[PDB]
Scaffold this active site. Structure first.
Site, PDB file in Angstrom:
ATOM      1  N   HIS A  72      -7.885  -4.960   2.919  1.00 42.90           N
ATOM      2  CA  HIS A  72      -8.843  -4.114   3.613  1.00 42.90           C
ATOM      3  C   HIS A  72      -9.313  -4.717   4.930  1.00 42.90           C
ATOM      4  CE1 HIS A  72     -11.797  -1.185   4.486  1.00 42.90           C
ATOM      5  NE2 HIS A  72     -11.953  -0.735   3.256  1.00 42.90           N
ATOM      6  N   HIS A 100     -12.925  -0.674   8.667  1.00 46.39           N
ATOM      7  CA  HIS A 100     -14.290  -0.171   8.519  1.00 46.39           C
ATOM      8  C   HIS A 100     -15.471  -1.140   8.530  1.00 46.39           C
ATOM      9  CE1 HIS A 100     -11.840   3.178   6.400  1.00 46.39           C
ATOM     10  NE2 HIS A 100     -11.894   3.401   7.700  1.00 46.39           N
ATOM     11  N   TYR A 117     -15.797  -4.227   7.452  1.00 47.66           N
ATOM     12  CA  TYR A 117     -16.043  -5.135   6.347  1.00 47.66           C
ATOM     13  C   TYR A 117     -15.688  -6.557   6.777  1.00 47.66           C
ATOM     14  CZ  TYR A 117     -17.128  -0.940   3.911  1.00 47.66           C
ATOM     15  OH  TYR A 117     -17.774   0.232   3.616  1.00 47.66           O
TER      16      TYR A 117
HETATM   17  C1  LIG Z   1     -15.577   9.356  -0.745  1.00 47.63           C
HETATM   18  C2  LIG Z   1     -14.737   8.435   0.155  1.00 47.63           C
HETATM   19  C3  LIG Z   1     -14.409   7.153  -0.193  1.00 47.63           C
HETATM   20  C4  LIG Z   1     -13.591   6.265   0.643  1.00 47.63           C
HETATM   21  N1  LIG Z   1     -13.279   4.999   0.209  1.00 47.63           N
HETATM   22  C5  LIG Z   1     -12.507   4.216   0.969  1.00 47.63           C
HETATM   23  C6  LIG Z   1     -12.119   2.864   0.531  1.00 47.63           C
HETATM   24  O1  LIG Z   1     -12.469   2.370  -0.545  1.00 47.63           O
HETATM   25  N2  LIG Z   1     -11.329   2.163   1.381  1.00 47.63           N
HETATM   26  C7  LIG Z   1     -10.854   2.630   2.646  1.00 47.63           C
HETATM   27  O2  LIG Z   1     -10.156   1.883   3.297  1.00 47.63           O
HETATM   28  N3  LIG Z   1     -11.205   3.886   3.046  1.00 47.63           N
HETATM   29  C8  LIG Z   1     -11.980   4.656   2.282  1.00 47.63           C
HETATM   30  N4  LIG Z   1     -12.312   5.933   2.690  1.00 47.63           N
HETATM   31  C9  LIG Z   1     -11.748   6.392   3.977  1.00 47.63           C
HETATM   32  C10 LIG Z   1     -10.456   7.147   3.575  1.00 47.63           C
HETATM   33  O3  LIG Z   1      -9.461   6.316   3.001  1.00 47.63           O
HETATM   34  C11 LIG Z   1      -9.696   7.931   4.653  1.00 47.63           C
HETATM   35  O4  LIG Z   1      -9.305   7.024   5.728  1.00 47.63           O
HETATM   36  C12 LIG Z   1     -10.548   9.045   5.187  1.00 47.63           C
HETATM   37  O5  LIG Z   1     -10.856   9.946   4.095  1.00 47.63           O
HETATM   38  C13 LIG Z   1      -9.840   9.815   6.295  1.00 47.63           C
HETATM   39  O6  LIG Z   1      -9.027  10.892   5.776  1.00 47.63           O
HETATM   40  P1  LIG Z   1      -9.333  12.393   5.365  1.00 47.63           P
HETATM   41  O7  LIG Z   1      -9.702  13.139   6.622  1.00 47.63           O
HETATM   42  O8  LIG Z   1      -7.938  12.859   4.830  1.00 47.63           O
HETATM   43  O9  LIG Z   1     -10.407  12.447   4.308  1.00 47.63           O
HETATM   44  C14 LIG Z   1     -13.129   6.812   1.907  1.00 47.63           C
HETATM   45  C15 LIG Z   1     -13.488   8.138   2.257  1.00 47.63           C
HETATM   46  C16 LIG Z   1     -14.266   8.971   1.450  1.00 47.63           C
HETATM   47  C17 LIG Z   1     -14.594  10.378   1.893  1.00 47.63           C
END
Ligand SMILES: Cc1cc2nc3c(=O)[nH]c(=O)nc-3n(C[C@H](O)[C@H](O)[C@H](O)COP(=O)(O)O)c2cc1C
Length: 353
Positions: free
Chosen positions: A177, A180, A182
Site C-alpha cells: 500500500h 493515499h 499512509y
Molecule cells: C468503501 C471504500 C473502501 C476503500 N478501501 C481501500 C483500501 O483498503 N485500500 C486502497 O488502496 N483503496 C481503497 N479504496 C479506494 C479504492 O480502491 C478505489 O481506488 C476507488 O474506489 C476508486 O474507484 P471507483 O471509482 O471504481 O470506486 C476504498 C474505497 C471505498 C469507496
C-alpha cells in the site's frame, strides 16, 4: 454476446487472468477485533470469477499500523488462520487473490496504538480533524513521532513478515500500500516528508522507504507475487507533492528493475498516468472513476492492462458478468460502505436475475 476488451485474457506474471475487471482494495471495517470474519468468506466468494483478480481490503501489518476500527490485520497466527477460509473460497472459484499489506503511519490516534503510544511517521506533524463516514463524528489524530534513521529498517521488516504471513494464509500475492497518504506515501510526498537524513530531501531519498520495502518483499516471496499501489496525484490525508508526475515517473522507472507482478496506479481527482504507463514496463493497473465504457477505452487506448473497480464492485457481486453482458448495474449505497453489519451493504447486493 460480442467480445469486449474488458473481457480479454491477460498474462500477469505467473498468472493467467481470464478478463481484466479487477476488484480494487476496499476497506469495509467489518473485521471485528482486527480479525478476518466468516462473512468476508461470502463477500469475496460472491465476487470471485475464474481467472479474475481480486485485491483484498487493506490489511494491517502490525499493531502500530492501526488507524481504524475493525480493519483486518495479518501479524498474528490468529489472523493468518482467519484468512485461510476466505482465501479458499476465492480459490474455490479460481480467482487470483492478492492481499494488500498496509500501515497507516500518522493516520491514527494513540487510542489505536499499543500502550497509548504516538503513531509513527517520517515527520512529527500530525493531521487536522476530519469528518468520519457518517457525517456526525469527528476523527481526531495524534501528532506522530518522527522515526529515526535506524528504526526505519525495522518497519521495512514489518511489511516483509506480513508478506510472508499472507503467503502462509494462502494468498497468491501481496499489494504494497504505497498510496493515499499512509506510511509509505507519507515518505514519498514532499508536503509531508521533511527529513534531513537519507529518507528525505531528494526525490530519490523520499522514495527510498518504498523501494526498500519493495525489495524486502520481492526478496521474501518472489517479485512475481508482488504488486504495489501508488497515488502520485492524490492529496488524501494531507499528503500532496509539488511534482506529482515526476514522483510518479520516478517511481515506475525505479520499479522496472524489480520485475514485479504489476504496478497499480490511481487516477487524478494536466495530470496523466499515460507517461507513467509508458515508462513502466510491466502490467499497469488503473483505478478511479471507471465504468464499463471508460474501462474498455482505457484498455483499447493502451492506457492499462487491467482496470480495478471499487464502488461498482461493492454493489455488483457479478461485476464482470454484468460488463460481459452489458447488463444494468445495481446502485451502491455509500452509507453502508463502512458500517459494521455482517450482511447489510456487504453481501446483500443481488446478482443478475
Ligand atoms: C468503501 C471504500 C473502501 C476503500 N478501501 C481501500 C483500501 O483498503 N485500500 C486502497 O488502496 N483503496 C481503497 N479504496 C479506494 C479504492 O480502491 C478505489 O481506488 C476507488 O474506489 C476508486 O474507484 P471507483 O471509482 O471504481 O470506486 C476504498 C474505497 C471505498 C469507496
Amino acid at each position: 454476446v460480442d467480445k469486449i476488451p474488458l473481457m480479454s485474457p491477460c498474462k500477469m506474471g505467473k498468472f493467467e487472468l481470464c478478463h481484466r475487471v479487477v476488484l480494487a482494495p476496499l476497506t469495509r471495517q467489518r473485521s471485528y477485533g482486527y480479525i478476518p470474519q466468516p462473512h468476508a468468506i461470502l463477500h469475496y466468494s460472491q465476487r470471485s470469477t475464474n481467472g479474475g483478480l481480486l485485491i483484498g481490503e487493506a490489511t494491517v501489518i502490525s499493531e502500530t499500523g492501526i488507524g481504524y476500527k475493525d480493519v483486518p490485520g495479518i501479524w498474528t497466527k490468529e489472523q493468518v488462520e482467519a484468512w485461510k477460509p476466505i482465501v479458499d473460497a476465492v480459490h474455490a472459484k479460481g480467482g487470483i487473490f492478492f492481499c494488500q499489506i498496509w500501515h497507516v503511519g500518522r493516520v491514527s490516534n494513540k487510542d489505536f496504538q499499543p500502550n497509548g503510544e504516538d503513531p509513527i511517521s517520517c515527520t512529527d506533524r500530525g493531521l487536522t480533524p476530519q469528518i468520519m463516514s457518517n457525517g456526525i463524528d469527528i476523527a481526531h489524530f495524534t501528532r506522530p513521532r518522527r522515526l529515526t534513521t535506524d528504526e526505519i529498517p525495522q518497519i521495512v521488516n514489518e511489511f516483509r513478515v506480513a508478506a510472508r504471513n499472507a503467503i502462509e494464509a494462502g494468498f497468491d500475492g501481496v499489494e504494497i500500500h504505497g498510496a493515499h497518504g499512509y506510511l509509505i506515501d507519507q515518505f514519498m510526498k514532499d508536503q509531508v516528508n521533511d527529513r534531513s537524513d537519507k529518507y528525505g530531501g531528494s526525490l530519490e531519498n523520499r522514495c527510498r522507504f518504498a523501494l526498500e520495502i519493495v525489495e524486502a518483499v520481492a526478496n521474501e516471496i518472489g517479485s512475481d507475487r508482488v504488486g504495489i499501489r501508488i497515488s502520485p496525484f492524490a492529496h488524501y490525508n494531507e499528503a500532496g507533492d509539488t511534482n506529482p508526475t515526476a514522483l510518479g515517473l520516478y517511481m515506475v522507472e525505479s520499479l522496472n528493475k524489480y520485475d514485479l507482478a504489476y504496478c497499480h496506479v490511481v487516477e487524478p481527482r494536466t495530470e496523466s498516468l499515460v507517461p507513467m504507463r509508458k515508462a513502466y514496463k510491466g502490467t499497469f493497473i488503473v483505478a478511479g472513476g471507471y465504468d464499463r465504457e471508460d474501462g474498455n477505452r482505457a484498455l483499447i487506448e493502451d492506457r492499462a492492462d487491467l482496470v480495478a473497480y471499487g464502488r461498482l464492485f461493492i454493489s455488483n457481486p457479478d461485476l464482470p458478468k454484468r460488463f460481459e453482458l452489458n447488463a444494468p448495474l445495481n446502485k451502491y449505497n455509500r452509507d453502508t460502505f463502512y458500517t459494521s453489519d455482517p450482511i447489510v451493504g456487504y453481501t446483500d447486493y443481488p446478482f443478475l436475475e
